[PDB]
Amino acid sequence: MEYRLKAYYREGEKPSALRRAGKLPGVMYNRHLNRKVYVDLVEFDKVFRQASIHHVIVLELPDGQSLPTLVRQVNLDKRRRRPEHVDFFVLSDEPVEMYVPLRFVGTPAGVRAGGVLQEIHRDILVKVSPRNIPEFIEVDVSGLEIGDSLHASDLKLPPGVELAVSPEETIAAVVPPEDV
């Protein structure tokens, strides 16, 4: 869950001041209708942090107009961390650009195996899924060694289907400690 406090003024001087209080610039955006609303960090963050929040949208409260949104971009801060501008898109009904949180279990044959461990490359999926993506899209296997690897092909796609990604290209693979 999310919400915020808008910017009548915008661009530079303002976002800076924001920062000053403890507010970072925020872009509220919906298919070609745009408004600069501004970020109260602390909380902002707890929220973001959920991360489940960054992968699977949430609802925000502005003025009193409860609406659906996610981050489609973000300027997180050079010299350290935290940000420089947080970016969200509220959706109508056709969400195609989806980097849905992805989980898969490489049930043993990996590290309990030849020492080799499994490297997670994809871990998430930017496929398609209009106003319909889980907090957890997932897949599984039982091999993590030899010179073994698997990807977008093997994949195994659930309910709100649609691969906006590619004909396989490394969800994960296993490498040796000092070989196997």
């Binding site: 973001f48 050079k78 010299r79 980097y99 590290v111 020492g115 490297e119 490498v175 040796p176 400690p177």
Partner: protein, 136 residues
Amino acid sequence: RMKYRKQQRGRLKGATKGGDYVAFGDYGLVALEPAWITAQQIEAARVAMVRHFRRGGKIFIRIFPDKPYTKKPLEVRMGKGKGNVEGYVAVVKPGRVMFEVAGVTEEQAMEALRIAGHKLPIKTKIVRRDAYDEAQ
């Protein structure tokens, strides 16, 4: 080190900021106040880590042996073509995304870094994955 089959003799000198950040495994060592760092020192860390980590499951990388540093002469008087190639290394300056894995699962990795860099050569910090990142 490795800056093999270069192409030229030498660089020059400056420094100020760049583009290192991400994550890449969740066992991260990020610089902060540096500049160039000996490809060697570098390997140092490499070692440090590698060894600590029960000595097997691979770490990853980060910067490179990048440039050719020259003290030219040996100690002469100065006016050589400034020639002489000699020490090769990294050029990372604004807290950089230095990325090292293994499967330590813990403040164990911590230590690994701890020393690796404590060593290495600067004011620096370390962590994990904190604000993902979306590409095309």
